[PDB]
Amino acid sequence: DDKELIEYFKSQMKEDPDMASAVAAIRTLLEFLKRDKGETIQGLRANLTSAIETLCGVDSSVAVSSGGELFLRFISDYSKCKKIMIERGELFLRRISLSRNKIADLCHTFIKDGATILTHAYSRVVLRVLEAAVAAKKRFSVYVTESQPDLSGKKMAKALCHLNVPVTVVLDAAVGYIMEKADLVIVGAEGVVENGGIINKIGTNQMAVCAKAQNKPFYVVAESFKFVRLFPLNQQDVPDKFKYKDLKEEHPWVDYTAPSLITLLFTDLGVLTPSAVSDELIKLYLG
Amino acid sequence: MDDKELIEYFKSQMKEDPDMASAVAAIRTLLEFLKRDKGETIQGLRANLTSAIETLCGVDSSVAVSSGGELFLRFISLASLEYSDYSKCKKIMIERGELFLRRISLSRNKIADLCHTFIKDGATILTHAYSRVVLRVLEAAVAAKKRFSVYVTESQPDLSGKKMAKALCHLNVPVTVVLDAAVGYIMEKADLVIVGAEGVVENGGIINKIGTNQMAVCAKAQNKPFYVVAESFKFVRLFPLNQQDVPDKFKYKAKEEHPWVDYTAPSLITLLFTDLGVLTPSAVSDELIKLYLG
Numbered sequence: 001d002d003k004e005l006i007e008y009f010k011s012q013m014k015e016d017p018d019m020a021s022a023v024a025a026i027r028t029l030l031e032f033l034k035r036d037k038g039e040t041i042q043g044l045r046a047n048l049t050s051a052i053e054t055l056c057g058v059d060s061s062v063a064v065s066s067g068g069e070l071f072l073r074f075i076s077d078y079s080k081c082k083k084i085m086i087e088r089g090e091l092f093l094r095r096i097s098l099s100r101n102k103i104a105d106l107c108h109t110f111i112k113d114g115a116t117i118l119t120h121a122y123s124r125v126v127l128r129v130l131e132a133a134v135a136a137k138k139r140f141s142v143y144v145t146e147s148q149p150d151l152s153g154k155k156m157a158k159a160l161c162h163l164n165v166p167v168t169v170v171l172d173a174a175v176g177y178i179m180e181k182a183d184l185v186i187v188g189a190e191g192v193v194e195n196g197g198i199i200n201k202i203g204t205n206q207m208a209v210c211a212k213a214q215n216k217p218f219y220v221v222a223e224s225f226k227f228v229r230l231f232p233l234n235q236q237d238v239p240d241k242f243k244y245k246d247l248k249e250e251h252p253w254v255d256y257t258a259p260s261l262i263t264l265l266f267t268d269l270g271v272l273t274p275s276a277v278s279d280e281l282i283k284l285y286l287g
Numbered sequence: 288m289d290d291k292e293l294i295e296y297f298k299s300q301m302k303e304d305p306d307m308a309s310a311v312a313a314i315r316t317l318l319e320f321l322k323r324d325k326g327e328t329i330q331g332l333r334a335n336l337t338s339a340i341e342t343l344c345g346v347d348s349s350v351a352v353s354s355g356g357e358l359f360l361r362f363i364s365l366a367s368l369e370y371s372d373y374s375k376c377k378k379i380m381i382e383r384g385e386l387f388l389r390r391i392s393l394s395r396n397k398i399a400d401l402c403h404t405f406i407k408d409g410a411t412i413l414t415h416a417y418s419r420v421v422l423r424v425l426e427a428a429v430a431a432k433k434r435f436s437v438y439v440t441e442s443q444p445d446l447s448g449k450k451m452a453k454a455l456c457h458l459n460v461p462v463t464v465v466l467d468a469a470v471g472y473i474m475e476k477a478d479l480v481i482v483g484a485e486g487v488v489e490n491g492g493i494i495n496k497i498g499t500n501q502m503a504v505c506a507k508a509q510n511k512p513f514y515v516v517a518e519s520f521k522f523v524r525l526f527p528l529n530q531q532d533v534p535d536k537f538k539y540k541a542k543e544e545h546p547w548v549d550y551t552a553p554s555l556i557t558l559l560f561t562d563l564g565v566l567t568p569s570a571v572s573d574e575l576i577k578l579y580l581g
């Protein structure tokens with residue numbers, strides 16, 4: 001049922017925080033598929049399409065939608081069928097579970113010794129990369145935006161001081177001021193779109209614009225289940241459902257960064273240029 | 288007066304008149320030092336005027352205080368020529384001082400007239416933090432019955448922008464407040480950007496509340512006009528080429544680095560609206576040089 005379909009999901013996220021919202025949903029979809037007491041290939045298919053959607057309502061991050069779409073895609077005689085569906089699904093889950101590791105290996109080599117890295121907000125993938133640089137005995141320092149409204153940035157600084165890397169938290173407003181001190185920018189993303197750009201915490205776009213104006217490379221680190229079937233041209237093309245996950249106050253939770261503002265993306269599919277994403281997205285979705 | 292003498296006065300001057308420019312607050316305090324100074328020698332006076340200026344900059348790091356001071360002191364220090372008795376100078380210095388104070392009393396309005404042209408109707412304007420000059424430029428637009436909308440950042444860490452939004456709301460001007468982090472996100476929705484300045488430096492760049500550089504750089508990438516409204520007394524004798532060149536004096540009012548102002552290069556500025564006329568950044572040096580020489 002939905003209500004403890006949701007509680008399973010939320011519970012899977014509450015007990016492991018550093019678990020991606022997507023992967024949490026896949027396990028909730030996997031477990032749902034297991035407990036499904038139906039008797040029709042047909043009613044199973046529907047109820048899964050109802051479960052994925054029910055999950056997308058409670059947490060409307062773009063990655064739980066795209067990851068959900070990809071996992072259900074990968075799942076392609078009810079007694080028989082059901083079983084191997086679960087085995088394909090558990091194979092798919094097994095693969096996206098090494099994604100963070102392969103990214104760490106890939107990206108951390110682009111960090112020169114004595115580099116000072118500028119990042120935005122909290123990214124579990126960025127932190128795994130920087131952890132891998134510490135593992136590789138590389139010495140570096142970090143600037144991170146405090147990142148209103150939830151102040152994820154201090155969460156990242158505190159995590160980063162536990163590995164004894166010098167980290168300084170700056171105001172969101174000070175990114176233009178601090179850009180000259182950085183040698184490169186690394187950020188994560190909630191979603192990677194078809195044109196090679198990204199959807200990430202509000203403030204990413206302006207960091208990328210200030211980075212291009214001082215010719216500082218701008219690197220993105222994201223798993224391939226974040227590849228989403230969208231092609232934005234402006235900020236209004238990002239669907240409002242992923243944007244909120246006479247005085248007034250607008251407050252979007254993420255903005256969009258165009259491919260022209262992005263140097264490379266480091267992914268479990270390999271190092272990519274923004275223009276190259278489209279060919280890799282096709283291969284990813286058809287497979 | 289003495290040191291806590293000036294500080295108490297100066298702090299009180301702005302305490303009761305919030306809209307009063309900080310530099311003007313210093314000029315009045317400095318004037319009151321000339322009126323209350325009972326010394327009886329010329330350069331001992333001047334020399335101690337050069338200590339009140341420095342003692343004042345200690346409590347308010349705004350770079351306008353230093354610039355406005357030096358221009359007033361340099362302007363009144365022309366009294367010594369052809370006024371030998373220390374009591375003759377003093378009298379005409381006070382005179383020249385209140386003359387000076389009266390000129391800059393006209394600076395905000397002279398600006399709000401020069402800039403009402405560039406606010407076309409139906410315009411969407413973006414600004415940063417709270418600027419009394421910006422506020423008066425818009426007051427003049429609404430006064431001329433012109434229709435326009437505003438976006439403004441909240442501007443950490445004091446949320447000055449929520450106070451700028453409060454005022455424009457009282458003008459029934461449609462306004463919206465966004466996060467400092469959303470300026471890149473919101474730029475496309477704006478037709479032009481207008482900010483104030485704490486200081487206009489010798490290359491036509493500005494020193495202004497932290498977050499101004501961000502906005503300027505994002506405005507250039509979308510080809511949006513970036514207009515600066517600033518009084519002629521904010522012209523400071525500094526030539527910063529980057530953020531490091533901004534002296535620590537004015538950068539902090541006092542690991543987490545929290546500067547209060549950044550530098551915005553002339554490359555990033557379309558026009559400056561000052562009480563000396565509408566200037567391109569490149570025309571600010573020669574204008575500044577004249578101002579400090581006459």
Ligand SMILES: O=P(O)(O)OC[C@H]1O[C@H](O)[C@@H](O)[C@@H](O)[C@@H]1O
Binds near residue numbers: 121125187
């Ligand atoms: O890299 P992660 O942790 O998966 O999340 C990626 C992104 O999620 C959110 O949008 C924010 O927290 C960003 O800071 C982060 O980059």
Ligand SMILES: O=P(O)(O)OC[C@H]1O[C@H](O)[C@@H](O)[C@@H](O)[C@@H]1O
Binds near residue numbers: 418485
């Ligand atoms: O326009 P004014 O009142 O001179 O303000 C000068 C400046 O003061 C501070 O630096 C900030 O509040 C800025 O927003 C403002 O531009």
